[PDB]
């Protein structure tokens, strides 16, 4: 038995936003602190790891820990009804077939009452964040979006570096080139909207744009993306979230 | 002869915009009272009723009944040239090969004239109201708006069905379902803004989406529109205007 | 050596908008007194001649002229990466491969360095500025914009014919006619926004819509657009700027 309301709906459409570059369908496993899902690109180069806590809820109840495995695209259509920012409820009972979703409104008061087909999907889930990684480093998910889209310009593939004290971003595909070179820093000044580097290695890593689009677009959620990045291994990108966070690993080029 | 002027040009296009699930094309019958039109579904089973009267316009004058057959894709596009709200002027003489529209601004006083090629085409015309509709209800144009767009997600199918004080709209596709059930009351509160049932019977029919979106395009022209529902009977959906209407009669399935 | 930098990068992206009616590729020939360019419509039909001076700029730098040649589309998109309006820088160098392109922020400091490949192509520059035009006018450029716009809606040929203090925009295709009729005229009033017109002989020419909607692209560089028009010859039609100006030279059908 589950019933899950988000006071603000807002919110649930703009996590199931940060799919699509998912696999049109994913599973929400729904345990006695939260919901986590999984989901991967087509060819297995993109993840998807999702977290939201109590705490990220108006109100929570889970009574025993239900996997709802549903569709995307269609649930994104039910969340289309929702006019964003008024109490979506989601809902499911001892053995699921379909989740129910209530939007409404509070003192204007019209109740609507969707529910969606469950698809009961086959679950390999997938714990490949490292514990080390040669570099770290956040800086507002702001910057990060239009550094991502302006170099997704010139070209297909946009190569991150991080040297002592220096990000590089740098595109160069057969149109042209551009870099966005950077400092760390930190002005005691605005609030946070600084940049944030440790660095333990050197690297230089290079992924599709086509992704990293597609990572990027999850920058409403946080204001501040955390990257991670190491040779061996994929990229951690991390935005965070009221007591949870959505995060997206994705494989380097070579 | 024919010299017909809406103060505001604004509201001829709104009225034109109200077809478009209408065939492209539709008589325009200018009596002595104003005008009214007629088109219907390329397959027969929606029909757009135009009533326009002399109250509704600025000034009007039609010195004898003429019947004005265009083509509203063309017409439409003529309307583009209307900065809305300013000054439409039709215009028609004593046997009629096009139609004549002027823009205009009053006071920064620039002028355009635009003539349109009358199709002249054959005018079947229809008389299906019923007098007796086993339910009217009237709810806000907008509310309707909404719960027509909302349920068109989830099935191609929107079933509407009035039982004693309850109105329920009723979606369900194969992806999902949906159902938005609503009170009648009235608040003596706001302004009109309420919702108005008056049933004779219970009523269980069921649309297709496709054209209640059409329908409701017209949500602009009105603030409330009215639907009427039997069984043997199409629905009858009614924006309302100074001193004329539009409306929308659809066949339901089975 | 070139350092050409706009203090308002939204400029020279506007200058670059008002081609595409041009060949997607342009050579821009950098002199010591600013920057000229030629663009032919593929049919050799439309030119666009830019000039922009060394006061358009906020700094400018020539050491020895140096030409240009560069793909449109491409050098587009950089611009893209421009949020317009702060500090587009141009360079090359001695003997130039590539421009650069240095886009900034001055006090929110964030600079990014993109490359653009260039294209080297062969130069027939072109002089066909008739001294004498038999009428020359000139009226808002906002205002032109929609009789273009307007009258591009009807036919796929707009007339243009100047008659003793009379300008008569004509569009007239198959499915209907419109005709834009305004005085020059001169209302000591407002600021400029006033009609001029000098004339020394009738005209009636004819464009190609299509073409006079991306002349009126431009629409934004200036407040008041500069037409030209003689019989023998084609029409320029002429934006201007700081120091500079935009224009097309359209040649009227038969």
Redesign the interface.
């Given at each position: 038995m589950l019933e899950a309301k988000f006071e603000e709906a807002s919110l649930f459409k703009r996590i199931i936003d940060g799919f699509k570059d998912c696999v049109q369908l994913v599973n929400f496993q729904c345990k006695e602190d939260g919901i986590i899902a999984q989901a991967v690109d087509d060819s297995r180069v993109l993840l998807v790891s999702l977290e939201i806590g109590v705490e990220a809820f108006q109100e929570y109840r889970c009574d025993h820990p239900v996997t709802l495995g549903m569709?995307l695209t269609?649930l994104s259509?039910?969340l289309?009804?929702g006019?964003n920012t008024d109490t979506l409820t989601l809902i499911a009972d001892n053995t699921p077939d379909?989740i129910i979703l209530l939007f409404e409104d509070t003192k204007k008061d019209?109740?609507?009452?969707?529910?969606?087909?469950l698809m009961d999907i086959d679950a390999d889930f997938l714990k490949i964040e490292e514990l080390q990684y040669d570099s770290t480093l956040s800086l507002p998910s702001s910057?990060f979006s239009?550094?991502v889209r302006?170099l997704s310009?010139?070209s297909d593939s946009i190569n991150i570096m991080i040297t002592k004290e220096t990000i590089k971003f740098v595109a160069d595909g057969?149109?042209?080139?551009?870099?966005?070179?950077?400092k760390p820093f930190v002005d005691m000044e605005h609030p946070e909207t600084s940049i944030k580097l440790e660095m333990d290695q050197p690297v230089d890593l290079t992924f599709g744009a086509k992704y990293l689009l597609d990572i990027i677009k999850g920058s409403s959620l946080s204001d501040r993306v955390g990257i991670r990045l190491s040779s061996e291994a994929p990229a951690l990108f991390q935005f965070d979230l009221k007591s949870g966070f959505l995060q997206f690993f994705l494989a380097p080029k070579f």
């Open positions: 569709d269609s259509k039910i289309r009804c006019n379909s019209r109740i609507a009452g969707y529910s969606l087909k910057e239009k550094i302006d310009q010139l057969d149109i042209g080139s551009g870099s966005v070179i950077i």
